[PDB]
Structures are given as C-alpha cells and as structure tokens.
Amino acid sequence: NLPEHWTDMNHQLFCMVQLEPGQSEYNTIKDKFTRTCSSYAIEKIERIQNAFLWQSYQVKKRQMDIKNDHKNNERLLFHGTDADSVPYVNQHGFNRSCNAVSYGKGTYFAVDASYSAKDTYSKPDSNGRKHMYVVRVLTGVFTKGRAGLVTPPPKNPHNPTDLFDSVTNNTRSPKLFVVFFDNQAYPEYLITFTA
Amino acid sequence: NLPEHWTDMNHQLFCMVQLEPGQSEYNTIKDKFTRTCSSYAIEKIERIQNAFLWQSYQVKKRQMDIKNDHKNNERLLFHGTDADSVPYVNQHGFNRSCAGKNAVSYGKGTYFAVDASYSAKDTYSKPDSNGRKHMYVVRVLTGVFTKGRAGLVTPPPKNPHNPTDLFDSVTNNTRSPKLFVVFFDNQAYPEYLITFTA
Ligand SMILES: Clc1ccc2c(c1)sc1nncn12
C-alpha cells in the first residue's frame, strides 16, 4: 500500500528520489524548513521511499489509531544527523540504541527545524553540508519525560503496561518528542543544506 | 491475519489461554522443555494471544522471507525471565533496552536459548516468592546469522564495504548455535509462557 506521491521503483523496495525545485511537494517541504531556517541554503530535498519501513510504520499507526480510539496520533517533526548515519537511517530508520537523553533513552525529534539545525545534531561534513530528516512520528498521547526512561511512563500506575505513546519536554508547548520503539517514526524527506 | 486456532477474543486485543495436557500443542512444548529440563516440573503452559505483537512480528517475517534467499528465518527458542517482567513481555514483547548483560555477551540485545536448560538457570528464570520460574517459548527471526561480539548494538554488516546490509541476528557459535541475540523490536513473538517449579 505504497503512497500515491511515490514514483515507480522498477519493482524495487528502496529508492531516494531527489525532488524537482518549484514543484508543489518540494515547495511544501521547503516551507516547513524555512519557517525557522530561512538563513540556511537548501542544496536538495530527497523523498525516502523505503517500502519495509513504511509498511512497519503504517501497521503501528493503524494499531495506535485503534488503541487511542482517534486518528490524531501523527506529527511531522525534524531530526538532525551526521552524514555517516544517513545511509543507516534511510535503510533502517531510527534506532534508540545508536547527544543528551534528558527526557529518556529514545530517539529525539524537534518541532522546529532550527533546533535540528544545530551543529551538535546536523553535524556539518568536510564540505560544510548538513542533513536533517522530515519525519512522520507517532507521538500519540504524550506526557512530560525525565532522564533514564527506557519506555514512556504508564498512563495510570493502576495498569502499569498501558503506556503513553511518547514523551516531551513540555506538554502545553512541546518543542521535542522522544519515541522508544522501532517503527514509531518514518523518515519521509532528507534535506541537504548549508549555513 | 490472526491464526484460526486461537480462541475468539471478542474484539479484545490480548488473551492468555491455558493449554490442556494430552493436547498435541501442550505435549510438544512439554517435550521441547523436558528434552533438557527433566529435573523441573511444569505447573502450566499458556498460549499468548497478542494481536498487535503478532501483526508487527508477521510483517517483519514477511520482509525477511522476501529479503533472504528461501531461508528458514524462524526458530522456536526459550527466554527465561523474572515474574516482574512477565506482564510487560506478555503485552509489549522483548525490549533490548530492558535486557540484562548475559554472562557470555555476544552483543547488547535480547538473548534466546536453543535449550530450555539454559533459560532454566535462576539467573534468567528467577524464582518468584512462591518458587515459580517463568520461561517463554518464542518465535525468533534468526534469519542469516554470524558469531556476535560484546560490542554490538546492532547485528554486524555481512560486508564491511556495505555497512547497512546487516546479518539478521548473531549467535555464540555458527557451527553449533546455543544462543541467538536480536537487536530490533518485533523480531521475536512470545508464543507460550511456561510456569514451572523444582
Ligand atoms: Cl535533547 C535533544 C537531543 C537530540 C535532538 C534534540 C534534542 S532536537 C533534535 N533534532 N535532531 C536531533 N535532536
């Protein structure tokens, strides 16, 4: 059930597709970035077409939509990474086993591109190029995180196995989300950009 | 896509089903266990019916069956654990972030034993306040494997010049595997819980 906006993959299961500047898809993703990163130069935006990651992610989305009994479980967030991690993320997605972990030992996603644009996350390579993903994240029902969490807290210490889906720095005005399970995040676009 | 021999769960997502001695399903698990644990006695065997864990696992199996060249990707292995972990495993499966350091480490993952005798050690199946020990029987996607190393946080690459094309699991010994380590969620389905005592 590979999405409409994807382009033909000649019966293959992984492709990185460079977007055409000035077309609708590129414009939409560029505007999400330039909201907080207008001072950075975009070199390119690639659509990540990973059939296996998409399938595993869509299964978790369907499960979370059933469990939470509504469909506002997904957010579009940013993740900055070093050039050496890009091949792994494109192929395997986000791995909590692989920077600070103040809100728990999971994968960190930013509301604002400006946060992911810090050199500590999007480490400039030899040539000065920085890399940031636009990520579909199943944030679901979230609570405030804390150091040392290995999973989100229970929604009620009466039923200790019924968990929040993610944690955040601030529930009223979140700027980051942490997820603690594989396939709760789909890397959708990779932005290559410079300071 | 739930298996047709599961009990009706009436739109519920999770059920533990107590098996009856004399049924082939109970007896094959008992035989697999007593092959190496004939000194212990089984209190009961429960089939774990977890709709969500089963779906995510079955998706990973289909992917590994596609990726690998007609391999038998799945093994039935043992996992001993403490009473305090059983409700989390029943609901959420095996979380590498919760895993103990194994006395012989082949990587930082979840460990599964070929032999019940290994899982039956008090170090893994810690006896509870009533002297009950707990062991899962687990469908594990071992796929294509190599000898692991204590440093691993994922399985190693098959080819050092293609670092993202990974082995599916690692083992203690490729000629005579006695344990397997997996490093991803939904790579193992807890199928049965054995409750046993001395
Ligand atoms: Cl504390 C923390 C750690 C990692 C991290 C953030 C915040 S925001 C962000 N964007 N990409 C990575 N990250």
Q: Which residues, listed in sequence order, are joined to residue B67 by a DSSP beta bridge? A: none
Contact assessment for residue B38 and residue B182, using Cβ atoms and an 8 Å cutoff: no
Asked if A180 and B97 come within 8 Å (Cβ–Cβ), the reply is: yes
Are B191 and B48 within 8 A, CB to CB?
Answer: yes
Q: Hey, is the C-beta of B14 within 8 angstroms of any chain A C-beta?
A: no
Phi, psi of A12 (to 5 degrees): -100, 170
Per DSSP, the three-state class of A113 is helix
Say whether B196 sits in a helix, a strand or coil.
strand
Ligand 1 centroid distance, CA of A183 (Å): 18
The resolution, in Å, is 1.9
On whether the CB atoms of residues B150 and B107 are closer than 8 A, the answer is yes
Pair of tokens at residue B189:
């389905």
**What residues contact A18, with CB distance under 8 A and at least 6 apart?**
A44, A45, A46
How was it solved?
X-ray
CA distance A46 to A134: 10
| Domain, as residue range, for B136 | 1-198
The first and second tokens of residue B19, run together, are 């098996």
Structural tokens at position A176:
């980051």
Q: Is A70 exposed, middle or buried (0-12, 13-18, 19+ CB in 10 A)?
A: exposed
Tell which one of A102, A108, A119, A133 to mutate to probe ligand 1, the residue whose CB is within 8 A of the most ligand atoms.
Answer: A108
Evaluate whether A189 touches A113 at the Cβ level (below 8 Å). Answer: no
Amino acid type, B103: A
Alpha helices of B20-144 — where are they, by DSSP H? 24-37, 51-67, 86-92, 116-119
Q: Residue A19 in contact with residue A26, Cβ under 8 Å?
A: yes
Q: Using CA atoms, how far apart are residues A187 and A16, in angstroms rounded to an integer?
A: 11
Q: Sign of the C-alpha dihedral, residues A70, A60, A165, B74?
A: positive
Diameter over CA atoms, chain A? 54
| Number of structural domains found in chain A | 1
The CA distance from A176 to A102, in Å, is: 11
SS3 annotation, B109-132: CEEEECCHHHHCCCCCCCCCCCCC
CA distance A104 to B57: 25
The β-bridge relationship of strands B133-141 and B188-197 is antiparallel
Query: How many angstroms separate the CA atoms of A103 and A124, rounded?
Result: 25
**A16 backbone dihedrals φ, ψ, rounded to 5°:** -95, 120
Nearest alpha carbon to residue A74 among A89, A64, A87: A64
Question: How far apart, in whole angstroms, are the C-alpha atoms of residue B51 and residue A138?
Answer: 19
- Residue B22: Cβ-neighbour burial (10 angstroms; 0-12, 13-18, 19+): exposed
Whose CA is closest to B132, among B32, B40, B36? B40
Enumerate residues 6+ apart whose C-beta is below 8 A from B170. Answer: B106, B107, B109, B145, B146, B147, B148, B149, B152, B155, B156, B180, B181
Per the listing, tokens 């997605």 go with: A93
Quick check: B39 and B198 in contact, CB under 8 A? yes
- N residues, chain B: 198
Residue A28 C-alpha, separation from nearest chain B C-alpha, in angstroms: 30
H or E element, residue A62 = helix A51-68
Please name which of B123, B116, B131 lies closest in space to residue B43, comparing C-alpha atoms. Answer: B131
Cross-chain residue pair B97–A160, CB shorter than 8 Å: no
Residue nearest to atom 10 of ligand 1 (CA): A116
| CA B149/CA A62 separation, integer angstroms | 37
Amino acid at position A112, single letter? D
Of A98, A93, A107, the C-alpha closest to A183 is A93
Q: How far apart are CA A120 and CA B182, in angstroms?
A: 30
- Reduced to 3 states, what is the DSSP secondary structure of residue B27? helix
In order of A7, A101, B82, B194, the CA distances from B87 in angstroms are: 44, 27, 10, 14
Q: What is the DSSP letter of A21?
A: T
Q: Among partner residues B55, B88, B96, which is closest to A161 by beta-carbon distance?
A: B88
Instruction: Give the number of other Cβ atoms within 10 Å of residue A164's Cβ.
Output: 20
One-letter identity of residue B130 = N
Q: If you ran DSSP here, which 8-state letter would residue B7 be given?
A: P
